[PDB]
């Protein structure tokens, strides 16, 4: 009798949202439906373009029901407020959405409440102004959850999906596969933070006050994560956006999506995570996440930069190109904060920088660099990461590089922190080495025969080549 | 240094309405003056304009209904950071 989607987000051991408010920017809603009645306030903020009654509030009512609905919702408690930025045909404008986001901020300034979650179950093409407003609203401390988009395409070409400092959500079905339907389906790629149930999702139907309907979409998926987020913020109201994002990733089911459904180049960029509620089991733990940069583009001096959130530390830095035409990567300081910068080679199509960004309070981290000697550097403190770059066209708390390369070690003073280094090598397209359960991968690199790159996937270090050795640095309290 | 942007997905563009975004520290009083200045310079050129909304709280700037003819003029006003042509969003 439990809808498949609510079972799917239930963790393997388990035991809301009322201190939290969730804003919905969508179509109009039927606020008297029994799933949500008395839990949703319609603001009657309205900003919509002209067309060109049951149908008008169908989309929004369903999503309001997915988030907080008493029978079929994720966060059955939670309070909601709705803004109308989509007309009866489900069309809105960027300008209308900005006015809506601005309205939320104004409301908050005039009558402050607790943590806010804003669900934006909508998408248009990439918008500089829309992404900036989302970012700006995020730095003010508001959590934003958005739909990846339904075009079976790279979510980075869409807004607010592509917007920095926002949780972007793709859709999976009852078989945990990406939803695909002809030329339509879930978006994917490095701007998607995680997936959630978004096919065949039962919820309030605006046909009648007790009716239910199944709908599908990245909007439905995003709604599960808004509900999950409302619960997490009720239990731990002081979470910053980065702590909330690291928790959503950590408590997700991992490696359950068959990534064959995605285009080849997006498989590596797309997180294989299906959202879940945190368990009853939770004392402090080390959380890390993998952040892919934008592709550097083909310029000879091109750099890709992967950054962490203000309250995270960059513990390691790696890079990857499909050609293997690569000058490696380095950790360099910038505004008093470390970023991961990767360098394109002459004639390369471009490269990605791949940061490992972690929540580590009481950490003092620095970088130790040595120019080309093989080349070696150590933490004279625990080693959390090795990076290496070169300027040539071709070839124990210690990092070792090629004799012609510079080598960079990330070293942290982190009392209460233990780290170990695990190595693995073989004859081979890909070599793999995982930290043990209860350990967190902080760094992933290849021992210095021609490597495309290395990157962390959850707690597994992957090295890609055309005598190769994967090296994982694993830490814990 | 002020730049213009419009939606890459051509069917989703909505020409004739523009979001004018001003530099970060611009004050609401300046946004208003800048909008009026645009309307005055436009009127002298024979163009009607309408200020639909003045932004403050997230981004400073304003929303304006006008012919795109005025964009060169608008990009040169004091405080302008960039201008974006409005475009469509859709329920997902």
């Amino acid at each position: 009798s439990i809808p498949w989607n609510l079972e799917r987000i239930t963790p393997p051991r388990y035991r809301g949202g009322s201190l939290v408010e969730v804003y919905l920017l969508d179509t109009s809603i039927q606020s008297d439906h029994r799933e949500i009645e008395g839990r949703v306030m319609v603001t009657d903020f309205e900003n919509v373009p002209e067309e060109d009654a049951s149908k008008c509030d169908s989309h929004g009512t369903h999503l309001a029901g997915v988030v907080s609905g008493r029978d079929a919702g994720v966060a059955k408690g939670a309070s909601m407020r709705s803004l109308r930025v989509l007309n009866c045909q489900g069309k809105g404008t960027v300008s209308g959405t900005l006015i809506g986001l601005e309205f939320i901020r104004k409301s908050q300034l005039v009558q402050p409440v607790g943590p806010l979650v804003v669900l934006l179950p909508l998408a248009g093409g990439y918008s500089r102004v829309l992404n900036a407003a989302c970012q700006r609203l995020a730095r003010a401390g508001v959590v934003l959850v958005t739909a990846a988009g339904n075009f079976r395409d790279d979510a980075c070409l869409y807004s607010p999906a592509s917007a920095p400092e926002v949780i972007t959500v793709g859709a999976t079905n009852a078989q945990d596969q990406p939803v695909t339907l002809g030329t339509l389906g879930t978006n994917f790629g490095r701007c998607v933070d995680l997936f959630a149930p978004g096919e065949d999702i039962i919820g309030a139907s605006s046909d009648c006050s007790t009716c239910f309907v199944s709908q599908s979409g990245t909007s439905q998926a995003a709604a599960h994560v808004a509900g999950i987020a409302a619960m997490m913020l009720s239990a731990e109201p002081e979470l910053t956006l980065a702590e909330l994002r690291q928790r959503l990733i950590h408590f997700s089911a991992k490696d359950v999506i068959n990534e064959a459904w995605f285009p080849e180049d997006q498989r590596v960029l797309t997180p294989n995570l299906v959202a879940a509620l945190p368990p009853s089991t939770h004392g402090w733990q080390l959380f890390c996440r993998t952040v892919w940069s934008a592709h550097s583009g083909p310029t000879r001096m091109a750099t890709a930069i992967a950054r962490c959130a203000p309250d995270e530390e960059l513990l390691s830095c790696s890079s990857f190109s499909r050609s293997g035409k690569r000058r490696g990567e380095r950790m360099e300081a910038q505004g008093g904060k470390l970023v991961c910068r990767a360098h394109n080679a002459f004639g390369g199509e471009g490269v990605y920088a791949i940061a490992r960004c972690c929540l580590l309070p009481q950490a003092n981290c620095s970088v130790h660099t040595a120019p080309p000697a093989g080349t070696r550097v150590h933490c004279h403190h625990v080693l959390t990461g090795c990076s290496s770059h070169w300027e040539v066209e071709d070839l124990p708390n210690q990092c070792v590089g090629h004799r012609e390369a510079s080598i960079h070690a990330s070293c942290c003073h982190a009392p209460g922190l233990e780290c170990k280094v695990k190595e693995h090598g073989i004859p081979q397209e890909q070599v793999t080495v995982a930290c043990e359960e209860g350990w967190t991968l902080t760094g992933c690199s290849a021992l210095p025969s021609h490597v495309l790159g290395a990157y962390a996937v959850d707690n597994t270090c992957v090295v890609r080549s055309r005598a190769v050795t994967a090296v994982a640095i694993c830490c814990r309290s | 240094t002020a730049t213009f942007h419009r939606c890459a997905k051509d069917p989703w563009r909505l020409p004739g309405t523009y979001v004018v975004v001003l530099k970060e520290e611009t004050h609401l009083s300046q946004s208003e003056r800048t909008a009026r200045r645009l309307q005055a310079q436009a009127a002298r050129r024979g163009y009607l304009t309408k200020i639909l909304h003045v932004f403050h709280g997230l981004l400073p700037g304003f929303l304006v209904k006008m012919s795109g003819d005025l964009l060169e003029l608008a990009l040169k006003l004091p405080h302008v950071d960039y201008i974006e042509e409005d475009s469509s969003v859709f329920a997902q």
């Binding site: 989309h59 988009g149 339904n150 339509l184 389906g185 599908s216 | 989703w12 997902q92």
Partner: peptide
């Protein structure tokens, strides 16, 4: 669907 609205337009 045009464009990915209401359940994949389906």
């Amino acid at each position: 669907x045009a464009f990915g609205x209401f359940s994949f337009a389906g």
